[PDB]
mmCIF file of C-alpha atoms and ligand atoms in Angstrom:
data_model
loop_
_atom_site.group_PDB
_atom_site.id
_atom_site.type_symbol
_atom_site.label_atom_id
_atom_site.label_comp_id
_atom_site.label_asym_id
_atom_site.label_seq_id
_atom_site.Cartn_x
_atom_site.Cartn_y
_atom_site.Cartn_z
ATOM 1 C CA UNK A 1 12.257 30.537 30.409
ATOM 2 C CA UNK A 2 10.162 27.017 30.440
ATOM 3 C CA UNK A 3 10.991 24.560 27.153
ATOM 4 C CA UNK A 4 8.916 21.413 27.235
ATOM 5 C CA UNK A 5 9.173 18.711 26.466
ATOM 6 C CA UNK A 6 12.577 18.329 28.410
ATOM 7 C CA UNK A 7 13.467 15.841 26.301
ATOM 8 C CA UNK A 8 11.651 14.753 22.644
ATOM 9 C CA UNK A 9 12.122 11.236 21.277
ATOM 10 C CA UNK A 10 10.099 10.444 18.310
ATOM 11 C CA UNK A 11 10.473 8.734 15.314
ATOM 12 C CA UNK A 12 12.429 10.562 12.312
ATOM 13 C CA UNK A 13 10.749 11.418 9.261
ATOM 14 C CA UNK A 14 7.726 12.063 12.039
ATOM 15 C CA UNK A 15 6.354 15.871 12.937
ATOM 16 C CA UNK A 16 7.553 16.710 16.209
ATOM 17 C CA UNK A 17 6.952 20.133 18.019
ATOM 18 C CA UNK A 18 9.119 21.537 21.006
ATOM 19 C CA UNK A 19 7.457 24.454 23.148
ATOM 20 C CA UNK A 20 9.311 28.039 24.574
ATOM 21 C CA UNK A 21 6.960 29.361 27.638
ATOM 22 C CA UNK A 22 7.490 32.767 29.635
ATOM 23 C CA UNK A 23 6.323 35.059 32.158
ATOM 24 C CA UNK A 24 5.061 38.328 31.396
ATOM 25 C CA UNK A 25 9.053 39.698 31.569
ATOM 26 C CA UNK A 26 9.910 39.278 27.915
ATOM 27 C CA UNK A 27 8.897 40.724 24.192
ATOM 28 C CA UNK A 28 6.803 38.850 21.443
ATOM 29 C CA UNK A 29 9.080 39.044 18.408
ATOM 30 C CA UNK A 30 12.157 38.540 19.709
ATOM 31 C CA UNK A 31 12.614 34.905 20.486
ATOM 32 C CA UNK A 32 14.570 32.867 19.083
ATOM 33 C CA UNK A 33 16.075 29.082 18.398
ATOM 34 C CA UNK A 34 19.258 27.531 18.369
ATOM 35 C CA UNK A 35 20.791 24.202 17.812
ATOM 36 C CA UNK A 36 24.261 22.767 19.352
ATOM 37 C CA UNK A 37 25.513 19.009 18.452
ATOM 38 C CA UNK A 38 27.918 17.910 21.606
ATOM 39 C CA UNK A 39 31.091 20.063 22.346
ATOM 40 C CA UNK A 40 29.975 22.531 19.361
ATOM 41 C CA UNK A 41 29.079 26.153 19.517
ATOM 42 C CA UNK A 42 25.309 26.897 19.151
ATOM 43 C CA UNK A 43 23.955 27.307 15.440
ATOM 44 C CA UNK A 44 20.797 30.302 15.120
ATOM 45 C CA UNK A 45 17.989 27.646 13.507
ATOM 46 C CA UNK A 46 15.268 30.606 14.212
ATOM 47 C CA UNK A 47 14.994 34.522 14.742
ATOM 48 C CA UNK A 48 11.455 36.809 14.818
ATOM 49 C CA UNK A 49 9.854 34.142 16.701
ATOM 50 C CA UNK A 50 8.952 32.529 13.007
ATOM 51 C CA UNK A 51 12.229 33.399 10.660
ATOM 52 C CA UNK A 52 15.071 30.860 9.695
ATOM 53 C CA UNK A 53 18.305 32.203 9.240
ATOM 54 C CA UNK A 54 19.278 31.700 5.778
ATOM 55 C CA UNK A 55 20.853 28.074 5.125
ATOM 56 C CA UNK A 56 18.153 26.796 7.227
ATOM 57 C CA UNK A 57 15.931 23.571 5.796
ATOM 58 C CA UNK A 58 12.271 24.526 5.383
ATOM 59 C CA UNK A 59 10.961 21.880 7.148
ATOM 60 C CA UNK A 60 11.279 23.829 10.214
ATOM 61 C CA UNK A 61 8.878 26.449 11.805
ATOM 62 C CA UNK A 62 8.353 28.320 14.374
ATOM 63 C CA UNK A 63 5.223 30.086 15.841
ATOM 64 C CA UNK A 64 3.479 31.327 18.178
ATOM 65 C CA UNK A 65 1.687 34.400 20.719
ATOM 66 C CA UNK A 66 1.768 36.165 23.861
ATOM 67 C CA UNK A 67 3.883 34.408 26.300
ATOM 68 C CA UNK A 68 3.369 30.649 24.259
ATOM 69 C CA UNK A 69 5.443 29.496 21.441
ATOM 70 C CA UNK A 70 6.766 26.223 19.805
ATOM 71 C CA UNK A 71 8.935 25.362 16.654
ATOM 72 C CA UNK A 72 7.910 22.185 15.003
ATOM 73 C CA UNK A 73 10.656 20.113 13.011
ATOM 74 C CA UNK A 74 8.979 18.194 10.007
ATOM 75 C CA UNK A 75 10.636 15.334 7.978
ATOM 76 C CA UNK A 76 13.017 14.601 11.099
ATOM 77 C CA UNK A 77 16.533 13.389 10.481
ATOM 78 C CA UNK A 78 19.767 11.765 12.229
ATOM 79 C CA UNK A 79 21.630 15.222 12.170
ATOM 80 C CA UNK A 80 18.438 17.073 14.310
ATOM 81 C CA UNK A 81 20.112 14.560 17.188
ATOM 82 C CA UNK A 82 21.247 17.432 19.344
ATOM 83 C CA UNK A 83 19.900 19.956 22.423
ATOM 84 C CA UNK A 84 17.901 22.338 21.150
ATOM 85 C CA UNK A 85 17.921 26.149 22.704
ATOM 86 C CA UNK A 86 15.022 28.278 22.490
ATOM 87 C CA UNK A 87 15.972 32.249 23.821
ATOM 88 C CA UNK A 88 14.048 35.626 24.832
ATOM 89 C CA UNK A 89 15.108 38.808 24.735
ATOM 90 C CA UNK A 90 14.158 39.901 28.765
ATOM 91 C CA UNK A 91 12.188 43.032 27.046
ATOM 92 C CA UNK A 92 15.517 45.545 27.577
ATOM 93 C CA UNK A 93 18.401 44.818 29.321
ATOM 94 C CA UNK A 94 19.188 41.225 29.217
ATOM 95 C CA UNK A 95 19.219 37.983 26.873
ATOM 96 C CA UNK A 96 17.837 34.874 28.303
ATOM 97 C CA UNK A 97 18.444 31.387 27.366
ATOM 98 C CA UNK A 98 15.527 28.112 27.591
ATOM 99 C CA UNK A 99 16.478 24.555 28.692
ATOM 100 C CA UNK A 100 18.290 23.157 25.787
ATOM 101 C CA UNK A 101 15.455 20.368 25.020
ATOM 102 C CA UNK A 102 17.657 17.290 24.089
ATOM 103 C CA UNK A 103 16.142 15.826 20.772
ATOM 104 C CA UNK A 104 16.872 12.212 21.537
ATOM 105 C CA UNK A 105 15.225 11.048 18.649
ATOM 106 C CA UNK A 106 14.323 7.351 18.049
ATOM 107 C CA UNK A 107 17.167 4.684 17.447
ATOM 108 C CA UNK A 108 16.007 1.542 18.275
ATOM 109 C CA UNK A 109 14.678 -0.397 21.545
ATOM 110 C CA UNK A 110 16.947 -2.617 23.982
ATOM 111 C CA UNK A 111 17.961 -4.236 26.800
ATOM 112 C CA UNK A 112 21.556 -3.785 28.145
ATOM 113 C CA UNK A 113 24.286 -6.215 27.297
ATOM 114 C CA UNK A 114 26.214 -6.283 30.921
ATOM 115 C CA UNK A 115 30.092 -7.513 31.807
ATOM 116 C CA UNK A 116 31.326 -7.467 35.102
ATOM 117 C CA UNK A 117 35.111 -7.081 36.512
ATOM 118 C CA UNK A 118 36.670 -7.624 40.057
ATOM 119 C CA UNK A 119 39.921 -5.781 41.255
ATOM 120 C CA UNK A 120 43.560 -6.526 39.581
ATOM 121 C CA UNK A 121 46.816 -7.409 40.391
ATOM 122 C CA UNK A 122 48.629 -4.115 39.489
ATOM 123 C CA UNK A 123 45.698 -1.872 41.022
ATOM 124 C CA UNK A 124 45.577 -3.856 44.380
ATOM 125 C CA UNK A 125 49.744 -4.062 44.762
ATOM 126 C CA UNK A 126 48.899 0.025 43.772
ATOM 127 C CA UNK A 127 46.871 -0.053 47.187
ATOM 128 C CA UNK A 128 43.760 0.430 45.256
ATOM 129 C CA UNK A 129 40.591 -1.052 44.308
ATOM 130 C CA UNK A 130 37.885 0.001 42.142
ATOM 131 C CA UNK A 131 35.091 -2.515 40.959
ATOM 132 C CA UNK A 132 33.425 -2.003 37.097
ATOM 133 C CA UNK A 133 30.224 -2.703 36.122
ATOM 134 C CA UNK A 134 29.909 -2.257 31.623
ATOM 135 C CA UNK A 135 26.260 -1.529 30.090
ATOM 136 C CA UNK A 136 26.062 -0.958 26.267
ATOM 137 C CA UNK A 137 23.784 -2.152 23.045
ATOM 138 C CA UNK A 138 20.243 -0.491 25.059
ATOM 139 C CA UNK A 139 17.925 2.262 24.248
ATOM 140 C CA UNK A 140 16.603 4.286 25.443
ATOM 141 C CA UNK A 141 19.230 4.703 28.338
ATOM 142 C CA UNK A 142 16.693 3.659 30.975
ATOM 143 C CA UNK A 143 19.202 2.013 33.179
ATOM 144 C CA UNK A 144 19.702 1.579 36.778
ATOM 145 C CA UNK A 145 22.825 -0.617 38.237
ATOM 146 C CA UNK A 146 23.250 -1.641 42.097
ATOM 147 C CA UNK A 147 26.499 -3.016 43.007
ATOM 148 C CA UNK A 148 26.252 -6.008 46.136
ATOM 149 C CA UNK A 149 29.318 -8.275 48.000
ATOM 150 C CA UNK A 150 26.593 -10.185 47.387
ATOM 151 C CA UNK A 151 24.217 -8.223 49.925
ATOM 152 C CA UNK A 152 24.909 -4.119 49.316
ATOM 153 C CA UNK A 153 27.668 -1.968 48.717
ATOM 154 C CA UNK A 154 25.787 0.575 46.385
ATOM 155 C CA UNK A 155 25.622 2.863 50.313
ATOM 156 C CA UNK A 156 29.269 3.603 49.236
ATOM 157 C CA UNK A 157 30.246 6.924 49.364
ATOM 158 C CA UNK A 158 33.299 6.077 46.317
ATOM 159 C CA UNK A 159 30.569 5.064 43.701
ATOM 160 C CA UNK A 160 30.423 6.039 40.785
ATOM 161 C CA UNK A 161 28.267 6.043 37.800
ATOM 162 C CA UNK A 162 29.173 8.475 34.487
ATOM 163 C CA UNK A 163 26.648 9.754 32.226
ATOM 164 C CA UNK A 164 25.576 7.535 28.863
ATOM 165 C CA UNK A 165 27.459 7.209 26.152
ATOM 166 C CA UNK A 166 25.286 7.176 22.124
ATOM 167 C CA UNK A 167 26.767 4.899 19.423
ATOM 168 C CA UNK A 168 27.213 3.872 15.796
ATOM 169 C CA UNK A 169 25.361 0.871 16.905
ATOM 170 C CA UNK A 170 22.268 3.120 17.368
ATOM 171 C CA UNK A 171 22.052 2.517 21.445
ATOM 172 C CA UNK A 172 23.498 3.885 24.397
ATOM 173 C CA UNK A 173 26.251 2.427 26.853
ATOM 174 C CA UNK A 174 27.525 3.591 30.811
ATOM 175 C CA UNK A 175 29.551 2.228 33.235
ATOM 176 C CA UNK A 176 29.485 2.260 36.857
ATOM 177 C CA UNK A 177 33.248 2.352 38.887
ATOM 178 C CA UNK A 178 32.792 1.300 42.748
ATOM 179 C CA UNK A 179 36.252 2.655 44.007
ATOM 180 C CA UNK A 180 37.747 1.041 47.325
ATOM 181 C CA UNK A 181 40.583 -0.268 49.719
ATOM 182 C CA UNK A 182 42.991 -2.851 48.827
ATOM 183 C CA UNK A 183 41.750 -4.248 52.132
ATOM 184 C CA UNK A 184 38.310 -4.522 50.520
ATOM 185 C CA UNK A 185 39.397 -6.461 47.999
ATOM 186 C CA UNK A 186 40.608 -8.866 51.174
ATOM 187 C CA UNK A 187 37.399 -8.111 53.212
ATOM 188 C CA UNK A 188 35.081 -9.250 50.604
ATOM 189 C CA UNK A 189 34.720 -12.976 49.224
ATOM 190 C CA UNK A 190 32.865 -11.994 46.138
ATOM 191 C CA UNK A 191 31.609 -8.787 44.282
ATOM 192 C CA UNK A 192 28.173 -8.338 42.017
ATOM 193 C CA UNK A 193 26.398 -5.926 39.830
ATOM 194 C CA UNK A 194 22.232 -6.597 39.185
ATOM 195 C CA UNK A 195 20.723 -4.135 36.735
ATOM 196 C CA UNK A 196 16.970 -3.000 35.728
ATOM 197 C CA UNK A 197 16.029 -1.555 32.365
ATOM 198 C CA UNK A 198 12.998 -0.912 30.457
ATOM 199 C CA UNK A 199 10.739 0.345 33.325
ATOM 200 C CA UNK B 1 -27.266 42.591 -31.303
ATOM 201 C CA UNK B 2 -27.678 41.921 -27.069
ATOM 202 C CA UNK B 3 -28.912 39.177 -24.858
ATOM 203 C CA UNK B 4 -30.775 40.466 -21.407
ATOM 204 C CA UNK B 5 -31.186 39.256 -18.021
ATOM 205 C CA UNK B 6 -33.863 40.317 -15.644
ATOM 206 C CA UNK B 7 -31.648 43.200 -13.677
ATOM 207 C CA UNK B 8 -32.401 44.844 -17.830
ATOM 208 C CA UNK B 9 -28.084 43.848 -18.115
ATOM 209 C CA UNK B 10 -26.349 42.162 -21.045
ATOM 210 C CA UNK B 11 -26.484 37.929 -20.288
ATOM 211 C CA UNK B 12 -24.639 37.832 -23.575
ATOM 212 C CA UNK B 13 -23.261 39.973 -26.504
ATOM 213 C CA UNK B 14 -22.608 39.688 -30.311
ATOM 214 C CA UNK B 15 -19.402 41.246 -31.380
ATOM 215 C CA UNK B 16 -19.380 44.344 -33.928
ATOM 216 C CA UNK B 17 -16.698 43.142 -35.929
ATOM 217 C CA UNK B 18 -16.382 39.042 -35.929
ATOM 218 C CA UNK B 19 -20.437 38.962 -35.122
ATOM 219 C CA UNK B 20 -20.093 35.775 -33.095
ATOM 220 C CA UNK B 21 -22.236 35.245 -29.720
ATOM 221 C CA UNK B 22 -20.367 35.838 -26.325
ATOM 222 C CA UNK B 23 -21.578 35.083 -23.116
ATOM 223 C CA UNK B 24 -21.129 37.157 -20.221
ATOM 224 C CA UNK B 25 -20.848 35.735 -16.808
ATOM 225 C CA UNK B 26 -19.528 38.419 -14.275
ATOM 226 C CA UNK B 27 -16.056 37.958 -13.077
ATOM 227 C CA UNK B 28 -15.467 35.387 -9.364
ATOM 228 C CA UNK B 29 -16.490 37.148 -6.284
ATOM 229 C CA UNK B 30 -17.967 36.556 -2.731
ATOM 230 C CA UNK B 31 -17.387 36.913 0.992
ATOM 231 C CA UNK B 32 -14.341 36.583 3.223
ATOM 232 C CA UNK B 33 -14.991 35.163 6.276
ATOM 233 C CA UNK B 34 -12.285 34.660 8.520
ATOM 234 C CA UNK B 35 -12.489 31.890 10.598
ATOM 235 C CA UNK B 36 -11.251 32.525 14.687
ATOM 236 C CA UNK B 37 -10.555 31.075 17.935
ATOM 237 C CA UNK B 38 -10.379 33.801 20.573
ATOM 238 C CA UNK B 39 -7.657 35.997 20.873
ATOM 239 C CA UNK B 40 -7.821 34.868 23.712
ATOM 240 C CA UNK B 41 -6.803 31.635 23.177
ATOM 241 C CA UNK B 42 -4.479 32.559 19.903
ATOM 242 C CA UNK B 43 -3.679 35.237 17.598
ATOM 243 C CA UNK B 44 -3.638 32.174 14.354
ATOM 244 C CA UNK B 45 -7.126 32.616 11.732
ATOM 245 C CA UNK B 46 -8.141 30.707 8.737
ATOM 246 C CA UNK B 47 -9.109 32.293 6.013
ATOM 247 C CA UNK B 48 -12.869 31.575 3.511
HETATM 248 C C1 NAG C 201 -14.930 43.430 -40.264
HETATM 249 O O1 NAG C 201 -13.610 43.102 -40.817
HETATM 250 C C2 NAG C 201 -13.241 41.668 -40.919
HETATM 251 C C3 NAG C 201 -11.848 41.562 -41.563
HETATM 252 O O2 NAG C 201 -11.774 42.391 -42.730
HETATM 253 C C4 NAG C 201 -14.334 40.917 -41.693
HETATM 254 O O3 NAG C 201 -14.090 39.501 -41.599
HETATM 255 C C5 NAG C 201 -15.717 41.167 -41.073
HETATM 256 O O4 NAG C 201 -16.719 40.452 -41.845
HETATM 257 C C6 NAG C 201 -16.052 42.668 -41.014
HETATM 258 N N1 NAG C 201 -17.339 42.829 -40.322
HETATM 259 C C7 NAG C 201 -18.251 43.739 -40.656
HETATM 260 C C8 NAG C 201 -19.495 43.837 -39.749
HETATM 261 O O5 NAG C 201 -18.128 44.449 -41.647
HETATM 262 C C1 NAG C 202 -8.471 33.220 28.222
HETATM 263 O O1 NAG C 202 -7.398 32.386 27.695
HETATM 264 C C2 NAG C 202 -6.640 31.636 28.711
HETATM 265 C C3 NAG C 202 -5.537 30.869 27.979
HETATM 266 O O2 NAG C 202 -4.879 31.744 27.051
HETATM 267 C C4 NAG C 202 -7.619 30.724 29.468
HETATM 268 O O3 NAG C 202 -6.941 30.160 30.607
HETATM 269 C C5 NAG C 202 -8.851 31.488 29.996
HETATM 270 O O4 NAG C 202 -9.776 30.530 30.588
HETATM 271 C C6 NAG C 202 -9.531 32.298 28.874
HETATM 272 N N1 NAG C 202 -10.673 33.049 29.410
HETATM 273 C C7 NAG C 202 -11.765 33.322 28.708
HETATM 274 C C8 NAG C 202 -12.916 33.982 29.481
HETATM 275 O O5 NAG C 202 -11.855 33.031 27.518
#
């Protein structure tokens, strides 16, 4: 299955429309939609291609025909914040999910907030290093970070940078972890992190 | 006792009983037209 956009951002309150495209392998009634917050087990928002499941708000609808077919939310809210599923029965045999279209609905607009930490004294008498680099208070979480000594060492193989983290304060945060030698930590007179954001 | 149109139809009436004057106009009616984009291009209509 295709589901476009791959992820949909607009406003709340807004109508917004996410699409469910197929190949010629699957049936016209039997699609479906589904909605899962993080961690959670999917909820059925959709059935029949056009049906909600009962306890469903009726500001959502789906439609469409042949092999093309959408479900528009109306009057978005906070709680739509999730990946949203479409799924196609594969006309016999087999169920088949879509992409899981995260609705990453708009918060606000920033640029990171950024602290930076060198190696410690119980991590380095440990034998260890590992170098941090903070980002939080931005959205959308259009972030890049480079770590330098204060050329480059972003070529390391032991870098590390985890996926974003959503907040109360209505923004993303990540953090990048450059893991290394105790003998780096001698090696190296100084250690730097430069980020871009917003483009 | 009747009023008359051209088709030789009732335009109006006066009742047998309350012998008032009633008008006649024939009850709402006219065309459906549905409108179409291909098939083609989608199975949705609108409806005139
Ligand atoms: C028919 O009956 C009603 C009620 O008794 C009376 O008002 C009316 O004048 C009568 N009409 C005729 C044509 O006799
Ligand atoms: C038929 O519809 C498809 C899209 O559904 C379009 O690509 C194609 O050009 C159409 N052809 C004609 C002749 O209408």
């Amino acid at each position: 299955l295709t589901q476009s956009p791959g992820t949909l951002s607009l406003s709340p309150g807004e109508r917004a429309t996410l699409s469910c495209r197929a190949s010629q392998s699957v049936s016209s009634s039997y699609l479906a939609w589904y909605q899962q917050k993080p961690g959670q087990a999917p909820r059925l928002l959709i059935y029949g291609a056009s049906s909600r499941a009962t306890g469903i708000p009726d500001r959502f609808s789906g439609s469409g025909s042949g092999t093309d077919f959408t479900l528009t939310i109306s009057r978005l809210e906070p709680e739509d914040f999730a990946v949203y599923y479409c799924q196609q029965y594969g006309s016999s045999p087999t169920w088949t999910f879509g992409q899981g279209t995260k609705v990453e609905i708009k918060r606000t607009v920033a640029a990171p907030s950024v602290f930076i930490f060198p190696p410690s004294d119980e991590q380095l008498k440990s034998g260890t290093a590992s170098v941090v680099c903070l980002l939080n208070n931005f959205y959308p979480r259009e972030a890049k970070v480079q770590w330098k000594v204060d050329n480059a060492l972003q070529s390391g193989n032991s870098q590390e940078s985890v996926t974003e983290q959503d907040s109360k304060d209505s923004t993303y945060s990540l953090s990048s972890t450059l893991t290394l030698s105790k003998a780096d930590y001698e090696k190296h007179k100084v250690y730097a992190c430069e980020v871009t954001h917003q483009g | 006792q009747f009023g008359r149109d051209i088709a030789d139809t009732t335009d109006a009436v006066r009742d047998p009983q309350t012998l008032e004057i009633l008008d006649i106009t024939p009850c709402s009616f006219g065309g459906v037209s549905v409108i179409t984009p291909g098939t083609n291009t989608s199975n949705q209509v609108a409806v005139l």
